């Protein structure tokens, strides 16, 4: 009957592009946390 809202296909290919986005977000989140950790180390050092 068609006439509906996606999304739908095309798997693989679709994953190829999707995988490119969000990874860098995780990286900068981890780096942010690490910077906080080091900051706390300095706070402890003082």
């Amino acid at each position: 009957h068609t006439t509906l809202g996606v999304q739908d296909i095309s798997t693989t290919a679709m994953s190829w592009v999707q995988k490119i986005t969000g990874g860098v977000g995780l990286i900068v989140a981890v780096a942010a946390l690490i910077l906080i950790v080091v900051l706390c180390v300095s706070f402890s050092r003082h």
């Binding site: 509906l4 996606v6 095309s10 860098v24 942010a32 910077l35």
Partner: protein, 81 residues
């Protein structure tokens, strides 16, 4: 009609636009732009954090250099003269 092949990669992805559409792609593009902004914001934050690390050792006196390499690209180049 307007065959909506699968791929690929991507390629076909844009072919679907014709199939069910006006819209679809524009929203995805906006989402991509938002993702880019998040990526850019992260980088900006990272650079500020890199400053936060090089702070203390920003006054003067020997002490890196040293950890300035290994050293997140500045660190150095920075220690020197």
């Amino acid at each position: 009609s307007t065959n909506g092949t699968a791929h690929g990669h991507p390629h076909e992805i844009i072919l679907y636009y014709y199939e069910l559409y006006p819209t679809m792609t524009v929203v995805i593009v906006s989402v991509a732009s938002f993702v880019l902004l998040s990526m850019v914001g992260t980088a900006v934050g990272m650079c500020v954090c890199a400053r936060r690390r090089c702070i203390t050792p920003y006054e003067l006196t020997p002490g890196a250099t040293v950890p300035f390499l290994l050293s997140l690209l500045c660190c150095v180049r920075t220690t020197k003269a």
